[PDB]
Amino acid sequence: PTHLSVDTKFKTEGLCVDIPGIPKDMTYRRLISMMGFKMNYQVNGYPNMFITREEAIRHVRAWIGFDVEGCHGTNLPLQLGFSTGVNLVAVPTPLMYKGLPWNVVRIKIVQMLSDTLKNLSDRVVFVLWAHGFELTSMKYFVKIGPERTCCLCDRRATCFSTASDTYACWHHSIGFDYVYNPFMIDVQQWGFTGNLQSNHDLYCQVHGNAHVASCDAIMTRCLAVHECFVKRVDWTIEYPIIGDELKINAACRKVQHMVVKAALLADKFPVLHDIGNPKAIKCVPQADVEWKFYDAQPCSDKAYKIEELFYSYTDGVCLFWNCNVDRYPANSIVCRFDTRVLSNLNLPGCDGGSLYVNKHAFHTPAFDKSAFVNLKQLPFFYYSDSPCESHGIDYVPLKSATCITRCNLGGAVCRHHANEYRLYLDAYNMMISAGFSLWVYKQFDTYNLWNTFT
Numbered sequence: 001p002t003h004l005s006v007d008t009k010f011k012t013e014g015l016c017v018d019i020p021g022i023p024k025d026m027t028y029r030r031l032i033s034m035m036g037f038k039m040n041y042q043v044n045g046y047p048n049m050f051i052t053r054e055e056a057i058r059h060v061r062a063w064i065g066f067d068v069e070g071c072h073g074t075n076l077p078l079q080l081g082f083s084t085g086v087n088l089v090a091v092p093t094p095l096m097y098k099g100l101p102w103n104v105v106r107i108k109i110v111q112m113l114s115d116t117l118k119n120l121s122d123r124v125v126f127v128l129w130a131h132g133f134e135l136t137s138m139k140y141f142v143k144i145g146p147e148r149t150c151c152l153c154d155r156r157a158t159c160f161s162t163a164s165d166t167y168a169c170w171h172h173s174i175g176f177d178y179v180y181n182p183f184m185i186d187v188q189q190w191g192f193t194g195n196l197q198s199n200h201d202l203y204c205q206v207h208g209n210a211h212v213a214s215c216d217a218i219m220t221r222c223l224a225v226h227e228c229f230v231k232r233v234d235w236t237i238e239y240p241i242i243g244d245e246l247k248i249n250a251a252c253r254k255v256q257h258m259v260v261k262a263a264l265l266a267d268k269f270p271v272l273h274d275i276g277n278p279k280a281i282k283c284v285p286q287a288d289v290e291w292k293f294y295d296a297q298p299c300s301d302k303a304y305k306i307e308e309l310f311y312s313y314t315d316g317v318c319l320f321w322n323c324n325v326d327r328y329p330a331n332s333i334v335c336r337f338d339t340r341v342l343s344n345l346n347l348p349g350c351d352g353g354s355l356y357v358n359k360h361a362f363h364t365p366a367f368d369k370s371a372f373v374n375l376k377q378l379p380f381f382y383y384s385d386s387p388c389e390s391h392g393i394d395y396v397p398l399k400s401a402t403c404i405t406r407c408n409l410g411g412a413v414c415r416h417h418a419n420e421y422r423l424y425l426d427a428y429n430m431m432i433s434a435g436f437s438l439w440v441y442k443q444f445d446t447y448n449l450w451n452t453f454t
């Protein structure tokens with residue numbers, strides 16, 4: 001069982017208000033047929049338009065919530081809503097658009113999906129809370145067939161053009177009018193009691209229902225992210241490299257060794273309490289300090305309460321490297337992912353949180369500035385006790401107050417420490433822009449690092 005069988009049953013109870021008289025016994029095969037699609041027994045990599053929950057999770061970057069609300073359905077205008085905030089009105093003749101015919105509506109859909117998805121995924125997955133009109137309206141902007149490649153590259157085809165009779169990926173679909181071979185999943189098939197608004201509002205207060213299709217589309221994908229990444233966490237699932245994943249991770253590791261090594265040299269703590277990831281290693285293996293580990297997995301719902309992390313039976317320093325707590329103690333070094341960051345790695349989440357996808361998927365709770373009241377923002381600095389010796393990438397004399405080296409203390413930064421400073425500043429910028437934020441105990445002062453050059 002790799003894919004979802006077309007002969008699997010589809011519960012049609014959620015469809016019988018828009019589609020009265022719908023058979024209670026229904027398969028995906030009859031549903032697809034009812035929707036106006038002829039699969040014609042094709043063994044060509046597209047076995048079903050609908051997918052399993054496991055396949056949807058593997059493709060979370062492709063998720064677009066989709067809802068259709070019949071404003072007045074053959075004779076009536078439909079309101080098409082997407083989890084991008086877009087509301088299009090199709091006439092059968094926050095971004096709310098006026099009534100236009102399907103031939104122009106379909107052009108806008110291809111443009112919107114391509115601009116939203118070209119840097120996230122090789123496909124689209126329409127996340128539904130299916131009542132009927134979204135499924136029946138699919139024939140107006142979707143064409144299906146065998147799996148294909150783009151006419152301008154080796155990526156899989158996600159669009160089709162009736163104007164040129166050609167196929168394209170999200171990057172080369174400019175002017176294409178049809179969504180080709182999309183995927184979809186109905187959240188209403190997961191066994192929920194009650195309507196979408198009531199199930200969604202149990203876990204989220206950020207999304208409301210201003211009574212437009214996009215509001216329901218946003219609530220749909222949000223409820224789907226909750227079930228698959230907040231209440232359920234599968235950390236075995238690997239995700240493709242779509243950006244600066246490798247650089248961002250290596251940058252985070254360089255920043256961590258730097259920041260922790262310097263705090264231990266500056267304030268000479270006898271013990272460091274490392275709270276977080278159970279698979280953690282000492283980031284400064286040669287430090288004098290008594291290193292003590294505490295296991296706490298990445299919380300994906302609410303930020304850990306310091307009362308429960310600690311008090312259950314102030315000396316030294318606490319290291320909270322990506323361990324999201326409600327209020328950090330004053331003696332801490334903290335790396336905290338900012339869920340508000342706009343990037344191709346950070347997808348929107350549930351209750352203000354976000355889905356950060358870099359190798360694994362991590363739903364992170366909403367960033368809260370009040371978690372850091374006992375700390376201050378960590379300033380940039382580069383520290384090095386390594387010998388001044390080149391080994392060699394051209395040079396322009398470096399002058400900086402934040403290059404804490406013997407050469408800068410002695411009056412002139414050497415070429416080696418200037419290359420190492422410029423590389424460290426790039427890794428630092430990479431990490432800050434990726435969404436991470438650095439915080440430290442208020443007594444941290446880089447002025448104390450100069451006296452380690454005796």
Ligand SMILES: c1ccc(CCNc2nc3ccccc3[nH]2)cc1
Pocket residue numbers: 273275294309310311312313314318
């Ligand atoms: C079950 C059993 C015991 C515990 C507390 C362990 N002792 C501890 N954790 C610390 C963190 C930071 C600083 C000092 C600490 N001492 C928690 C859960």
Ligand SMILES: [Zn+2]
Pocket residue numbers: 150151152153154155168169170171172
């Ligand atoms: Zn292409």
Ligand SMILES: [Zn+2]
Pocket residue numbers: 200204205206207218219222223349350351
């Ligand atoms: Zn929500």
Ligand SMILES: [Zn+2]
Pocket residue numbers: 387388389405406407408413414415416417
């Ligand atoms: Zn030097």
